[PDB]
Structure 1
Amino acid sequence: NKINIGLAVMKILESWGADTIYGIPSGTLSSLMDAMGEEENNVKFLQVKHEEVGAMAAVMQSKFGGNLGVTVGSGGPGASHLINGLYDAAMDNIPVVAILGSRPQRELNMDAFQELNQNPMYDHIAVYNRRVAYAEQLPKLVDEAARMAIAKRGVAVLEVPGDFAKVEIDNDQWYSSANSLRKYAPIAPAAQDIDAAVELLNNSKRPVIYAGIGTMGHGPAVQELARKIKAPVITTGKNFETFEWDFEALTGSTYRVGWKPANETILEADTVLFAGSNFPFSEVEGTFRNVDNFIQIDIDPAMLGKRHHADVAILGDAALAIDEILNKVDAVEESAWWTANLKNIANWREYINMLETKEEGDLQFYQVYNAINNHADEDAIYSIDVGNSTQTSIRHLHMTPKNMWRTSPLFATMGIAIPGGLGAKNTYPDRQVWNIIGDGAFSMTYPDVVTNVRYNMPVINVVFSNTEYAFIKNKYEDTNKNLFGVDFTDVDYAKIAEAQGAKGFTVSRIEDMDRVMAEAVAANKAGHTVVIDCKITQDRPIPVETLKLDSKLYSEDEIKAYKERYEAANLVPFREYLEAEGLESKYIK
């Protein structure tokens, strides 16, 4: 009883649940692909236009809760095109199997055509990186690659000479260890550490909960704890979906891609409950410079006390920890700290709502997000690209745990949106998927819009056309001293979409946004991939990391100019709200 090595490989991938391979077919990968669909195998190939899109899609697939992704790249240039997707997965600790094709074994080291040592290529970021030495061990290595990708939460790479998959072996000369896959259940926290945390929280006059994705799946519990001890909630740029968008005590996120409330709260807080987070701006932006006590909860020992000295360290699942704390902590009836924060939050929501609900004028991204909120399904999935217009989505999207919002948050590679949409739609074929993209990022990946069309994976692409980079337009004055230089004409994305078999729309006026969005959604429900080219203004989101509103921190002229520029006449500095409740700023003046 013999079996083709390529088929054995497909059977192994199938056993691990990796039923989708992303890439472009070619010579150095043909032997493997030729076995797909054989003997009832269910592994399918999803062909992309650029390998980086395939790599990112394989990765985003897991981020969205899908199966283990597999991405391939032909010897040399195909393999190197995977880099942005693999680095993203490495930094986000996302499991993914990358198979690098290669010239046949006989050609290795001969300086043959497109023949090179690809082992160095991804050695720095991989959790597994090997060049298959002979055909007969390919199955064992693919099996281990999957096992390692999952166990080590990262990129497992295999360089495979193109002649190996054609070889035949005895069926008893291969096996899958997928049946032995086991994962650790939630780890219960140490009572000693939970008690120390409870004591600090009980004695704090200004507690604040800072929740990262470690709290995913436990938003209701966090909101319950927040209300019990009257502690406002701050979230991370990756964790907005965990909370009800309209939660009374949600202050948003800190720093640039955040809200005004969160940025003011963290500088006035006394005790922080850092739950399931590895906020990267912590040290360099002095996020916790005014905090007195720091309590951290995490399942990874490497993270304990990393972003700030921890007065209390809790090793364990955030869910279990939050529950234990919720049960032991004292209830707080009233709090000036809480009252002041709720008003500060309400003030901010009045501002955001007024921008979103404008009725006429030149289109701004604010109204595009408004239209999305008015037409999106309650369980819609959002694949967000990297840029100023897209990341500001967290100030507008009315999400809940029913949604999923993913991007490239740390490596922050542009072009992640479209790949994300493919991974999502592949995992949830009957679910509404949105790709929110800036024109710069769209320009790096729009050729792959045809991929959604060809594979009947309908998505809604929302493109923000604002000529010059909005975000980049904010780093030649706040850091530099000269002008700018980031111009771009204006290509017709809607026309390009039509040329690709997709449905294109173009909108540039607030009064036309709702209708255009309605037609776009209806078109998507008819099974079409759509591209909405939103010609927006040059307006930038109000800089919440530099709030020029407090008269004790900035001059009248500054405040006046700041308000006029961002239409923020009605925003009120947090200190006013603190003082209105009988409290005083702990750092201002």
Structure 2
Amino acid sequence: TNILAGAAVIKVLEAWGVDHLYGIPGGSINSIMDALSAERDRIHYIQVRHEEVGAMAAAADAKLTGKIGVCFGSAGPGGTHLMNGLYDAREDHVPVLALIGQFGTTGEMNENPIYADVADYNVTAVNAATLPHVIDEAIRRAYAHQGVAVVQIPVDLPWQQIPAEDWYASAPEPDVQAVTRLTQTLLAAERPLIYYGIGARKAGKELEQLSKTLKIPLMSTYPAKGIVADRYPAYLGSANRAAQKPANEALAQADVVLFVGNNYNTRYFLQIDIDPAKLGKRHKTDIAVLADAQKTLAAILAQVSERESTPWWQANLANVKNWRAYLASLEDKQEGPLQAYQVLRAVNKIAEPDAIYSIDVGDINLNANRHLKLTPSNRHITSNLFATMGVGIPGAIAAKLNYPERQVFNLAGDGGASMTMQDLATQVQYHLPVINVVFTNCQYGFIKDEQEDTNQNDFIGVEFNDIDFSKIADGVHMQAFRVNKIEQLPDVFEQAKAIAQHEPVLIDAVITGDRPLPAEKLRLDSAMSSAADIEAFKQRYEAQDLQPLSTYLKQFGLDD
């Protein structure tokens, strides 16, 4: 028996469990549209307002669920609009299929070169009969390479009849010597760190147990926030840069670092990874164990005993408390000019235990990293390695489509919200009760801070005219609020919390131009800087009560 080549493509997608896909129709892709139309019962098509949002939401689908994301764009400008979302997925290593329209084989640009760089698989379908098989292979290449597969489909092909009976959709324990050699080196260290990334997703319980047992402080990569609960008193934050003070400071001091599902004064580097091509990378590393994170951590645990509090442990616990109190003093202001810190507190107050956070790119990464309180039941996404602005809105859309029953925030700077603002209309249209929080500083704040640090001449391109996002949201028929004072927060967030039981809501938070404390440029220690520099720093960042790790090392007898 026969079938339209288009209808078979859609069946290939359903066979792989694709629940929703994103795009904007064009004549060059209307035969795929026709097939999607017949299947609206079985697959959910989300019409976006800019195809980049579709490509970003697809990456975000795959970041959230591990399942391939699917987007499409019309020939020429529809497909090229996909680029920021497709690079995002290439660089964060998530599977995404993109379909691109193309004029019919009989019925004039060469599209294939356009996708050669971003895609791990990039083919133009030549024949209706193999069209479904090409889609099937694209999907398995995407999964195989954890990246982008691109298929360009000449528009006549999906309208051709083909046979149905012919197509298909084709849908270990660690080394016990090494584990001991690893444990021993870890045991002997004076300043041990356990430093994990998303490779340790399944291993949060073990990480926390090992940390408290052996009195060893924990730090994560930025995407690894929430794998171990933030409130855990020996969790230092992340290093590198949405960087938190305690992690940045301890790293300089450690003598042995255990890298768990990661790959970033240290004499020994210890490493656990599932992938051998990852065992060496940043500096000559001394013990590399090839194995699963959860198991190797359980194998360490099964052969160690509770040590008692060491100096290192106690200086770190003290630094963490001091940092946390600093953050709390920012959060706890009750009245006055609104700043990012209180908006994040108010977010914390309304957040449910399993909230999902879609985070844009800018000061929000730094601020969310420090103020959000996450646990293993939270999820948070962003564009990590490509770091494209604009992903807050699309990430929130995907989150809500995958998890209709969970609370979803979109946290975004105004520069980033502006880039994908139109797709606020997409939340209204598809009834996705996202809570959007726009941090309005009228600046590219992250880049102003960078220019402050490097440029000789005046600021340029980093301060701009205000956009009132509560009117933008009104424009797309979404309820919204604009606040500019701390004391407005409680009531506005309660309203948002309730509106989002049924419909999207936006809060436009007009915040000050205050720079968030920079963890790599501390001026806290009387040794390394002037008394006046320290006074200016403390004034600027309201950090009068913040102490350097210097202070706590000495309080416990350790050298700096």
1:307 partnered with 2:282: yes
Query: Structure 2: which amino acid aligns with 1:27?
Result: G
2:285 & 2:408 partners in 1: Cα distance? Answer: 40
Q: Is the 8 A contact 2:538 2:544 kept in 1?
A: yes
1:48 partnered with 2:23: no
Cross-structure match for 2:320 = 345
The secondary structure found in structure 1 opposite 2:165 is helix
Q: Deviations over 1:166-198 (max 9, x none)?
A: 0001111201110xxxxxxxx422223212211
Give the TM-score of the pair, scaled to structure 2: 0.98
Q: Deviations over 1:217-258 (max 9, x none)?
A: 321210110111111011111111101111010111113312
Change (3 A) 1:32 1:564: same
Cross-structure match for 1:85 = 85
Cross-structure match for 1:456 = 431
1:521 Cα deviation (Å)? 1.3
2:173 & 2:151 partners in 1: Cα distance? Answer: 37
Cross-structure match for 1:110 = none
1:215 & 1:154 partners in 2: Cα distance? Answer: 21
Change (3 A) 1:86 1:380: same
Specify which of 244, 251, 269 is matched with residue 266 of structure 1: 251
1:408 Cα deviation (Å)? 0.2
Cross-structure match for 2:209 = 224
Change (3 A) 1:190 1:411: same
Q: Deviations over 1:326-354 (max 9, x none)?
A: 22234311201101110111011110001
1:420 partnered with 2:412: no
Query: Structure 2: which amino acid aligns with 1:274?
Result: F
2:211 & 2:537 partners in 1: Cα distance? Answer: 33
2:431 & 2:137 partners in 1: Cα distance? Answer: 33
Cross-structure match for 1:296 = 271
Change (3 A) 1:84 1:39: closer
1:124 partnered with 2:103: no
1:188 & 1:419 partners in 2: Cα distance? Answer: 39
1:390 Cα deviation (Å)? 4.1
1:210 & 1:569 partners in 2: Cα distance? Answer: 29
1:197 partnered with 2:173: no
1:39 Cα deviation (Å)? 6.8
2:161 & 2:28 partners in 1: Cα distance? Answer: 18
Q: Is the 8 A contact 2:243 2:366 kept in 1?
A: no
Q: Note the 1:112-261 alignment, pairs <5 A.
A: 115-178=108-171, 187-261=172-246
Most deviating of 349-358 and 383-392: 383-392
Q: Is the 8 A contact 1:37 1:43 kept in 2?
A: no
Most deviating of 250-259 and 394-403: 250-259
Query: Structure 1: which amino acid aligns with 2:68?
Result: L
Most deviating of 141-150 and 532-541: 141-150
2:242 & 2:232 partners in 1: Cα distance? Answer: 19
The secondary structure found in structure 2 opposite 1:105 is coil
2:105 & 2:357 partners in 1: Cα distance? Answer: 43
Give the TM-score of the pair, scaled to structure 1: 0.93
2:134 & 2:111 partners in 1: Cα distance? Answer: 17
The secondary structure found in structure 2 opposite 1:413 is coil
Specify which of 435, 441, 454 is matched with residue 466 of structure 1: 441
Cross-structure match for 1:582 = 557
Q: Is the 8 A contact 1:385 1:391 kept in 2?
A: no
The secondary structure found in structure 1 opposite 2:519 is coil
The secondary structure found in structure 2 opposite 1:156 is strand
2:348 & 2:546 partners in 1: Cα distance? Answer: 23
Specify which of 488, 491, 498 is matched with residue 464 of structure 2: 488
Most deviating of 563-572 and 299-308: 299-308
Q: Is the 8 A contact 1:220 1:243 kept in 2?
A: yes
Most deviating of 354-363 and 481-490: 481-490
Cross-structure match for 2:19 = 19
1:342 & 1:481 partners in 2: Cα distance? Answer: 40
Change (3 A) 1:529 1:66: farther
The secondary structure found in structure 2 opposite 1:72 is strand
Cross-structure match for 1:517 = 493
Change (3 A) 1:494 1:333: same
1:480 Cα deviation (Å)? 2.1
1:488 Cα deviation (Å)? 1.2
1:14 & 1:439 partners in 2: Cα distance? Answer: 37
Cross-structure match for 2:477 = 501
Change (3 A) 1:491 1:326: same
Cross-structure match for 1:430 = 405
Query: Structure 2: which amino acid aligns with 1:502?
Result: M
Provide the aligned length of Structure 1 versus Structure 2: 559
2:16 & 2:317 partners in 1: Cα distance? Answer: 48
Q: Is the 8 A contact 1:11 1:41 kept in 2?
A: no
1:320 partnered with 2:295: yes
Q: Is the 8 A contact 1:384 1:391 kept in 2?
A: no
Gapped regions of structure 1 (runs ≥ 5): 108-114, 179-186, 280-289
1:562 & 1:573 partners in 2: Cα distance? Answer: 13
2:328 & 2:16 partners in 1: Cα distance? Answer: 46
The secondary structure found in structure 2 opposite 1:564 is helix
1:85 Cα deviation (Å)? 0.5
Q: Is the 8 A contact 2:337 2:512 kept in 1?
A: yes
Cross-structure match for 1:73 = 73
Q: Is the 8 A contact 2:128 2:162 kept in 1?
A: no
1:366 & 1:40 partners in 2: Cα distance? Answer: 44
Q: Is the 8 A contact 1:389 1:470 kept in 2?
A: no
Q: Percent identity?
A: 47
1:37 Cα deviation (Å)? 5.0
Cross-structure match for 1:479 = 454
The secondary structure found in structure 1 opposite 2:113 is coil
Q: Is the 8 A contact 1:390 1:436 kept in 2?
A: no
Q: Is the 8 A contact 2:66 2:94 kept in 1?
A: no
The secondary structure found in structure 1 opposite 2:119 is coil
1:258 & 1:19 partners in 2: Cα distance? Answer: 36
1:478 Cα deviation (Å)? 1.7
1:389 & 1:55 partners in 2: Cα distance? Answer: 22
1:32 & 1:41 partners in 2: Cα distance? Answer: 16
Q: Is the 8 A contact 1:217 1:401 kept in 2?
A: no
Q: Deviations over 1:259-312 (max 9, x none)?
A: 111111011111000111133xxxxxxxxxx21110111112221111222100
Cross-structure match for 2:103 = 103
1:67 Cα deviation (Å)? 3.5
